[PDB]
């Protein structure tokens, strides 16, 4: 038993990380087949680049302007292109460690594993959720750009994030692997801010289900509420609305515990209006919303990824 925030094993991704290093700027790249993907802002910017023309900068560059290092090894770049905010560098060598992979775009509320890297060397791994305001609460320092987020599906790696920047509130923003930002952000060093965050209601409910399963029950009551009644409580406490689909995917957990989903929602008011009243749930004094319903099921069962 037990419930822990748990990243996917990172070995399949560690073998794809490289250092991409142009001019004075160093960041990480993702080496798949004979292409290295990295954030486009690696391109030697103006000096002054109040507003960089990435299209025009890339035309001024040759192949060897880009130094790519794989472990201690130099990779020969033979072509370079851009797709949205990602720079695609062709290399002469296919990565022999390339896993089965697909590029996917993730929805807010869904989670993925982050492999933080520096100078092309993996440094750590942790789980993040795509917030409703399209930021993630991560841990990134200078040189971490190009770190990627992913999920593993048996043996298929679904890459879903590149890392790009940090917002003034200390949270983080990035793109999918096709170079499309999550959220209303741009890759310029200008005034940017995250919208007011909301709480992922369906994940909170899943986490409460995980709590009852592991023995925590003080917050339950015999009351219920209709879907409409709850949503007005959520809208006051800055929570995502709860849809009939959300209730549906929570079905399995309702069976395991014998609480109807709306019958759990009655608890959630209680937590929202009154609070936890000096108590804790799964070792937290807050309501946690970065465990998806599947994350909970992936945890009560043992799903491995050979």
Report residue 26 CA to chain centroid gap: 22
Cβ closest to ligand XTM, residue 140 vs residue 207:
140
Active site residue 22: no
Residue with CB nearest ligand XTM?
A: 145
How would you class 282 by CB atoms within 10 Å of its CB: exposed for 0-12, middle for 13-18, buried for 19 or more?
middle
304 scored as a contact of a copy of itself (CB under 8 A): yes
Q: Could you list the residues that contact ligand XTM (CB under 6 A)? A: 1, 27, 41, 49, 140-145, 164-166, 172, 187, 189
142 binds a copy of itself (CB under 8 A): yes
Q: Which is nearer to ligand XTM, 131 or 172 (CB)?
A: 172
- Considering the candidates 145, 160, 172, 265, report the single residue annotated as catalytic: 145
Q: Is 94 in the site for a copy of itself (CB under 8 A)?
A: no
The single residue of 41, 163, 164, 246 carrying the catalytic annotation is: 41
Cα separations in angstroms, 280 against 49, 121, 216, 286: 50, 38, 9, 8
**What is the rounded distance in angstroms from the CA atom of residue 21 to the CA atom of residue 71?**
14
CA distance linking residue 40 with residue 247, whole number of Å:
40
Q: Is 145 a catalytic residue?
A: yes
Contact between 299 and a copy of itself per CB under 8 A = yes
CA dihedral 23, 20, 108, 235 (to 10 degrees): -30
Which 251-290 residues touch a copy of itself, going by CB under 8 A?
276, 280, 283-286
Radius of gyration (C-alpha) of the chain in whole angstroms:
22
18 touches 26 (CB < 8 A): no
What residues are annotated to the active site?
Answer: 41, 145
Q: Which residues bind a copy of itself (CB under 8 A)?
A: 1-12, 14-15, 71, 115-119, 121-126, 137-144, 166, 170-172, 214-215, 276, 280, 283-286, 299-306
């Amino acid at each position: 038993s037990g419930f822990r925030k748990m990243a996917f094993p990172s070995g399949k991704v560690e073998g794809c990380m490289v250092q991409v290093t142009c001019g004075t700027t160093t960041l990480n790249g993702l080496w798949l087949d004979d292409v290295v993907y990295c954030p486009r802002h690696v391109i030697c910017t103006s000096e002054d680049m109040l507003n960089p023309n990435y299209e025009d900068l890339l035309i001024r560059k040759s192949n060897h302007n880009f130094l790519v290092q794989a472990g201690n090894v130099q990779l020969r770049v033979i072509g370079h292109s851009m797709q949205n905010c990602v720079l695609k560098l062709k290399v002469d060598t296919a990565n022999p460690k390339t896993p089965k992979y697909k590029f996917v775009r993730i929805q807010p509320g869904q989670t993925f594993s982050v492999l933080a890297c520096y100078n092309g060397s993996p440094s750590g791994v942790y789980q993040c959720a795509m917030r409703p305001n399209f930021t993630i609460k991560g841990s990134f320092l200078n040189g971490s750009c190009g770190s990627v987020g992913f999920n593993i599906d048996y043996d298929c790696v679904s890459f879903c994030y590149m890392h790009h920047m940090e917002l003034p509130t200390g949270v983080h923003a990035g793109t999918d692997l096709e170079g499309n930002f999550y959220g209303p952000f741009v890759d310029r060093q200008t005034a940017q801010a995250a919208g007011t965050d909301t709480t992922i209601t369906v994940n909170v409910l899943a986490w409460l289900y995980a709590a009852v399963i592991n023995g925590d029950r003080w917050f339950l009551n015999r009351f219920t509420t209709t879907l409409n009644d709850f949503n007005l409580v959520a809208m006051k406490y800055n929570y995502e609305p709860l849809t009939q689909d959300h209730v549906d995917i929570l079905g399995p957990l309702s069976a395991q515990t014998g609480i109807a989903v709306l019958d759990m929602c009655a608890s959630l008011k209680e937590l929202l209006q009154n609070g936890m009243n000096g108590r804790t749930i799964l070792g937290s004094a807050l309501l946690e919303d970065e465990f998806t319903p599947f994350d909970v099921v992936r945890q009560c069962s043992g799903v491995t990824f050979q």
